[PDB]
Amino acid sequence: LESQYQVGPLLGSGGFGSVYSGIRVSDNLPVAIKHVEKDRISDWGELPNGTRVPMEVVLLKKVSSGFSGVIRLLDWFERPDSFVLILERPEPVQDLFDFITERGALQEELARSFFWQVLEAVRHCHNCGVLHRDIKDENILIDLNRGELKLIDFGSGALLKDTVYTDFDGTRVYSPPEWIRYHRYHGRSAAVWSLGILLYDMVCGDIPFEHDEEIIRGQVFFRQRVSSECQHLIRWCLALRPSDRPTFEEIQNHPWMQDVLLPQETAEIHLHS
Ligand SMILES: NC(=O)c1cc(Cl)c2c(Cl)c(C3CC3)n(CC3CCNCC3)c2n1
Question: Is 14 buried (19+), middle (13-18) or exposed (0-12) by CB count in 10 A?
Answer without folding.
Answer: exposed
